[PDB]
Ligand SMILES: COc1ccc(C(=O)n2ncnc2N)cc1
């Protein structure tokens with residue numbers, strides 16, 4: 001009924017974007033979702049609060065310094081108590097999709113470690129991280145946007161937060177005519193079953209035209225096979 | 238040398254997460270990146286500033302109301318002047334990867350439209366949007382985190398913002414021994430060519446073990462073929 005997410009980040013104020021606004025902001029205010037951040041800079045001891053360090057072997061960039069990051073992670077783990085899964089966000093991780101969101105959402109506690117600079121020491125991944133997850137095959141400046149993405153996606157599964165393999169159907173609202181384009185008459189018919197079938201058929205058609213590989217992974221129902229065949233025949237004029 | 242990004246969002250304060258922090262915050266402060274937000278709520282005229290509307294055909298949710306959203310988009314387009322590409326973020330869009338980031342980054346101006354609720358009227362996509370892009374196959378509560386993700390990814394290509402198909406290699410920094418785990422000696426050798434080859438070989442090995450489909454899409458160099466063959470022979474003990 002409740003999810004707790006610990007976050008380790010050099011920029012914890014970024015997480016206001018999900019804790020103060022919208023559906024996820026409401027979830028936090030209503031105690032359905034709790035997001036708690038620890039900043040490695042607070043675990044430094046030198047006068048200039050150093051949180052990066054030079055990579056062995058040379059190279060352009062810097063890495064996160066091990067001692068402050070490690071101490072922040074340990075503090076988060078102590079706060080979480082038993083049973084928290086520790087996740088490092090990176091492009092080398094398991095690719096996130098909705099199946100994986102649904103899996104992650106089964107956890108009552110997560111700790112999310114956000115890398116900065118060129119990333120974190122490999123031995124910390126070995127000794128502190130349970131799983132690595134990627135939000136997609138593109139490179140970002142840090143792990144915070146992937147962590148927020150993951151939080152937002154799992155939050156949708158917490159009961160009370162909100163009020164099947166296919167792409168969504170098109171949606172229409174007022175006015176009935178917009179730049180000469182009319183709303184499909186079936187949607188104004190009030191025929192609930194025709195509307196259901198139209199929506200399903202559109203989703204099948206859109207998945208086939210835009211993401212046909214997604215169909216290969218589905219066991220279509222008899223009704224879905226029929227509506228898809230119909231959509232494909234109509235497309236073939 | 239400069240990128241301008243117009244944003245249409247009901248929660249423009251979320252974009253502080255990228256405009257006030259880190260590498261992207263520095264890019265904004267130094268005028269390399271400009272992010273400008275318009276909020277549909279500011280284009281409403283009724284007393285309670287309504288920005289949602291009921292979907293034709295029924296259904297659980299709401300859609301963004303057309304008139305305020307449309308007016309916000311028109312205002313952003315007027316601000317952009319000629320040549321801005323207008324992007325709607327959604328799971329029905331083209332899947333973002335680094336090739337697509339590099340393509341988007343060729344644009345001097347982008348306008349990013351962030352959906353909320355169940356999304357936006359299909360006729361607005363037809364009449365106002367140039368391209369739809371997805372950051373991945375998972376469902377979020379709105380388009381803002383995908384828009385920020387996209388901004389962060391393209392920002393890395395603006396000259397001055399920062400100081401090949403494979404996953405990254407492991408990275409190490411101090412201490413030389415951490416929980417009994419030592420830094421690989423090659424990285425402490427100072428032999429720049431051995432270090433280069435070790436890194437490349439690790440990237441090839443990691444891509445093969447974690448994401449083998451990514452290799453099928455590459456024309457490996459002779460050196461890469463060799464190091465991959467070596468890594469695969471060592472794995473086969
Ligand atoms: C410097 O630390 C990091 C930089 C980038 C990413 C990143 O890009 N991720 N993470 C998950 N999925 C993606 N794409 C992660 C960490």
Ligand SMILES: COc1ccc(C(=O)n2ncnc2N)cc1
Nearest residue numbers: 326327352353371372377380383
């Ligand atoms: C209600 O409006 C929206 C809800 C979700 C998304 C979304 O999830 N996106 N967008 C790009 N890539 C992904 N995954 C977009 C709009």
